[PDB]
Amino acid sequence: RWSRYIGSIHTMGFATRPTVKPVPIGSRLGFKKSSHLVRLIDTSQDRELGRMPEDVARILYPLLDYSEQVSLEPYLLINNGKRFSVGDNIYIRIDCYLTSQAFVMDTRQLHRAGAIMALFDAINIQPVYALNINQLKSFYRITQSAASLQNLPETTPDESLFKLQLRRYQKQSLSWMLKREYEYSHLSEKMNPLWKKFRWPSNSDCFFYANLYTGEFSIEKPVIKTIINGGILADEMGLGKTISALALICTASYDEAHEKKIESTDTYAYRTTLIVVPMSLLNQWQSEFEKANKDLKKRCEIYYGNNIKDLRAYVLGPNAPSVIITTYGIIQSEYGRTSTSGLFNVVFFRIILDEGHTIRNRSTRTSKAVIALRSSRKWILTGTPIINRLDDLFSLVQFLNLEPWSHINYWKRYVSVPFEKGNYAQAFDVINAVLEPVLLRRTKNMKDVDGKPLVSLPPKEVIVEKLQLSSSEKRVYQSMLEDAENSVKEGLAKGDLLKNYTNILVHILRLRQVCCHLDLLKPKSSISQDKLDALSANFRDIHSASEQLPSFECAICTTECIEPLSAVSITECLHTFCEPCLAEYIEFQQNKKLSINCPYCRMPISEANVLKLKEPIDAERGYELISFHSHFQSTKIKALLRHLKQIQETSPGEQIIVFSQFSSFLDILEIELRSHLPRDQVIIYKFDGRLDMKERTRILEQFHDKDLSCIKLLLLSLKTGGVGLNLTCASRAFMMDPWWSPGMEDQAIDRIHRIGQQQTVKVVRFIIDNSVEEKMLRIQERKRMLGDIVEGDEAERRQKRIEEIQMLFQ
Ligand SMILES: [Zn+2]
Ligand SMILES: [Zn+2]
């Protein structure tokens, strides 16, 4: 037991009891505990004296609970000589002491730190020295503004296990990841801002250290910090985000400190690294591993669809794999049904969360599932740790289990509340203090030591993606090609090919339209994917699981149980029928031209809106409603959706432009894209052109509006280009069709990129293989050699036309 003075507080007190006897000057008064009311009591008379004001009772009342910790010794000050009448002022000099019981249930611990922190403020002792896009960029401007992060050592793995060449920055991130996991064996060679340093008074060592966030005190300077294996690797996409992480697993693939521990002589998978990855990147991580791993001894395997029967025994067995990749939807699925096969009865050696910002909503089952995973070392690969809210970082901290910020009460007290009340400058300093030793963020805009940017960003990158038509599209393209080949034989047999020059371009145009979509020549459903998910949810809620088997009544034949389940025909209004019974009704109602109504509720059920169950039934999700009649999508629209369904998880907030010369094609695109994509994650904008000037600028207004919770699409005509339209905010473009002149397509692409931007424009050109579109590219390559400009209007003009007509069929 020791004691030491720390400070004094002067305060007037209102008298409570009318003491008549004179009160000594240096009276050793005391504080008794019981809007708040604290009591004054003379130590020798054992009688109450007065009450303290509200602004002082709030400081003293919670400090009395920690008498062993903080002792308050009040002394009397002024001796007017008169008895304390009802209301006379009592002048006190409160002396404060910090006992060794303070020096070295979250609400119990926070109430103590808050009470002591309030005392230090009154003592006045100081140490020795939803989000908007504008508020979010101010956050990055600090958390990415580390003090010269360009001097991190470059660690190189031996090229017997890693067959890729790491960049300058990729070699640095590998060394930092090895340092975060305390893997010194693969490194050459080679405080706590939250803990501040106070000073001792000298009126009644010369320093002492304290952390007023947790209320902890220490004699010496405690440098103990960061008892965490791993961290968060934030980076702009393309800084070797995934490639660097694979370099870590190939460098250290198992717990080396544990193999010797068990060989010296269980639910520890001391050799397996779990990589939770979105399904859109499920096979890419498998591919990126094989493309990078050279050591055949360590193998990776995808865990999807319950392919591995017993995962618990397999991952701690004699030949467990070094990497296991699985979907968040697998973690979320097995977490709900209490699946005890694996993933929750083993402590994996390492866990890596690619695009880990998908657990930002801590209240969803997917987030609760990821935090429930046990591992020795944890990692978070995320290009955007914050999406739309500040507490999105909390789940990233709660996953890493960073004490005491993993506790929600510490976060809401020191981060959420000070931010939500305008004092954002402090909450940013608390966040930046706990994530500084854990997170490492770099930028393609950052410059190196030599004087070059980390990544040379070209203005654009155009890529031609060749597609092959469907089985039905080739027959239409062939039928239109046969008639196109005949109109050439007609004019050529008449002595002059150009006698059908207008008639041939019509057949060529119809060939161009077939490649885009077949509906551009002259039973389509009217239910989007968002509605099918809503109808499936309503359907599973109606026919809920119980003791007995599922039964489905037919509203026509009154059959209590329809068999088989594939013969179940479900209307737009979620009413069950026998598939033959419903078809007989529609055929009878169509042969007499009577409008179709539901035989159960008499509602306008459209024939294309008839639904059926998915065959087979996923036991983890239940019944799924798909269109009874099969829907068709053009090969290019099928390819575009395949790109967009990946950029959705590849990069949030990305604005994309879709080009097409056919105005009707853009109309079909909007209908198909909005139908097959979720509305809360993909926003589609179209440029009709005929709309008023204010609405067209209002569309571009909402399009430029950056939003990391969705991706935005702009469907404008290639014909008009983007003349007078600001398109700088776009990072990706899609050329759904080529044109005769290359200048019109190049000009539209060049209206996107502006020098001084942090992202290159990625362009993809969908060209149907061995089609007229592939021929039109060779025409553009001719116009890039000499131009649309031509000499001669007599013979040279006619001769030039003969070449292009032939090139389309060569
Ligand atoms: Zn029936
Ligand atoms: Zn009905």
Residue numbers in the entry: 174 to 207, 224 to 293, 311 to 335, 360 to 420, 431 to 444, 454 to 514, 539 to 795, 827 to 1114
Paper text:
We screened through a number of fungal species and were able to purify a nearly full-length fragment of Rad5 from the yeast K. lactis (KlRad5, containing residues 163–1114) and crystallize it in the absence of DNA. Structures of the mercury-derivatized and native crystals were refined to resolutions of 3.3 Å and 3.6 Å, respectively. Minimal differences were observed between these structures. One native crystal was used for diffraction data collection, data from three mercury-derivatized crystals were merged and presented. The structure revealed an elongated shape of KlRad5 spanning 140 Å in the longest dimension. The HIRAN, Snf2, and RING domains are well resolved in the structure. The HIRAN domain and the two lobes in the Snf2 domain are nearly aligned in a line, the RING domain is located on the side. In contrast, the RING domain has little contact with either the Snf2 or the HIRAN domain. In our structure, motifs I/II have located over 20 Å away from motif VI, suggesting that KlRad5 rests in an ATPase-inactive state in the absence of DNA.
Rad5 possesses a ubiquitin ligase activity and catalyzes the Lys63-linked ubiquitin-chain modification of the proliferating cell nuclear antigen (PCNA). Rad5 also possesses ATP hydrolysis-driven DNA translocase activity, through which it catalyzes the regression of replication forks. The remaining part of ScRad5 contains three distinct domains, including a HIP116 and Rad5 N-terminal (HIRAN) domain, a superfamily 2 (SF2) DNA translocase motor domain of the Snf2 sub-family (Snf2 domain), and a ubiquitin ligase RING domain embedded in the Snf2 domain. These distinct domains endow Rad5 with DNA damage site recognition, replication fork remodeling, and ubiquitin ligase activities.
